[PDB]
Amino acid sequence: RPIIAFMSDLGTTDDSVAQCKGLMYSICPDVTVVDVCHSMTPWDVEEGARYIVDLPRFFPEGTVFATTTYPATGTTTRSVAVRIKQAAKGGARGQWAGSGAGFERAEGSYIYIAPNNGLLTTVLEEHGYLEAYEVTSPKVIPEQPEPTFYSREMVAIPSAHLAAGFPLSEVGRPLEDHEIVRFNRPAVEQDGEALVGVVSAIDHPFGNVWTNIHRTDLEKAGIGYGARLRLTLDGVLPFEAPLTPTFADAGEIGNIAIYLNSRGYLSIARNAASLAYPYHLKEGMSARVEA
């Protein structure tokens, strides 16, 4: 009973996703196709990455992630399929997802198939990989790919073949590490004991504000759950609050909460109100934090 979890930039306004879904049931009739999300900003591979990197621990082993934004559609470029290593713990503590102590997940248990455009950068950085292959076999892609729709032709279609049991090694030749494209993610800067980063994203639809300053960064400045923090956004907004587990820890509705979000990252928001929407806060603004 195999699952393909499908993340694209195709939107949900026309029949493009359905076209892929139809081909997924044509090829693997007993497949369950779980939508991740299709709303991402087109061609923004750093954002697409955000929506896929935390997925594996939540799915049954054998799940295939089909993840694509494909600006080089119609070119000699060919996709990449990789088996990941660690399923990886996650969240604010670092733990397995699920009831009890959680579903512990085996190694080598999930496959990603994506354009070779850097979309899987963080996936590989945070999980590792056991093997990678270029996707060129006409048993899993079309002989005549539709030039402008490689997200269906070089991702959806082969993802269903893999989901139906088609051997990963037979999709094409192995790829060396340097042949897999990456983007570089900027580091969290240091010193003064302060940490300098950015707003990775606005957490829709709440308007929470997410930074790229991970828990591991907070640790190794000695920052923990009682610490009176000062987090400055956009160079001019020095918010001040203790680091708390959650939103209601700020007291009244509307108050400020500095917390670790559900993916392990330092964040700021308001208790049952929007921080970012009234003040038009945006991804890309700076983010410093300190004692």
Task: List residues binding ligand 5FD (CB under 6 A).
Answer: 8-10, 42-43, 68-71, 73, 148-152, 206, 208, 247, 269-272
Q: How many residues bind ligand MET (CB under 6 A)?
A: 9
Binding site partner of 51, from ligand 5FD, ligand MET, its own copies, none, Cβ cut-off 5-8 A by kind: its own copies
Alpha carbon of 160 to those of 13, 15, 182, 217, 245: distances in Å?
Answer: 23, 18, 25, 39, 40
Residue 214 phi/psi, 5° resolution? -75, 170
Supply the minimum distance, in Å, between the C-beta of residue 115 and ligand 5FD.
8
Nearer to ligand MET, 14 or 252 (CB): 14
Binding site partner of 285, from ligand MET, ligand 5FD, its own copies, none, Cβ cut-off 5-8 A by kind: none
**Among the residue ranges 8-16, 110-118, 169-177, 275-283, the one whose residues contact ligand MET (CB under 6 A):** 8-16
Residue 250 gets the label, from left (phi > 0), alpha (psi -120 to 50) or beta, of alpha
Q: Does 96 bind ligand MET (CB under 6 A)?
A: no
Q: Does 262 bind ligand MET (CB under 6 A)?
A: yes
Annotated binding-site residue? 203:
yes
Annotated binding-site residue? 109:
no
Supply the minimum distance, in Å, between the C-beta of residue 128 and ligand 5FD.
26
Say how many C-beta atoms besides its own lie within 10 A of residue 43's C-beta: 13
Binding site partner of 139, from ligand 5FD, ligand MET, its own copies, none, Cβ cut-off 5-8 A by kind: its own copies
Cβ burial of 99 (10 Å; 0-12, 13-18, 19+) is exposed
Q: 134, 173 in Cβ contact below 8 A?
A: yes
Residues numbered 191 to 250 that lie near ligand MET (CB under 6 A) are: 203, 208
Q: 240, 230 in Cβ contact below 8 A?
A: yes
Helix (H) or strand (E) holding 231, with range, is strand 228-233
Q: 108, 84 in Cβ contact below 8 A?
A: yes
Annotated binding-site residue? 57:
no
Supply the minimum distance, in Å, between the C-beta of residue 173 and ligand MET.
27
Annotated binding-site residue? 54:
no
Annotated binding-site residue? 212:
no
Residue 125 phi/psi, 5° resolution? -70, -35
Q: 24, 163 in Cβ contact below 8 A?
A: yes
Supply the minimum distance, in Å, between the C-beta of residue 236 and its own copies.
26
Supply the minimum distance, in Å, between the C-beta of residue 62 and ligand 5FD.
25
- Of 73, 219, 228, the closest CA to residue 147 belongs to 73
Nearer to ligand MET, 121 or 261 (CB): 261
Annotated binding-site residue? 200:
no
Q: 156, 20 in Cβ contact below 8 A?
A: yes
Q: 221, 197 in Cβ contact below 8 A?
A: no
Show binding-site residues for S-adenosyl-L-methionine.
9, 14-16, 70, 151, 203, 208, 262-263, 270-272
Show binding-site residues.
9, 14-16, 70, 151, 203, 208, 262-263, 270-272
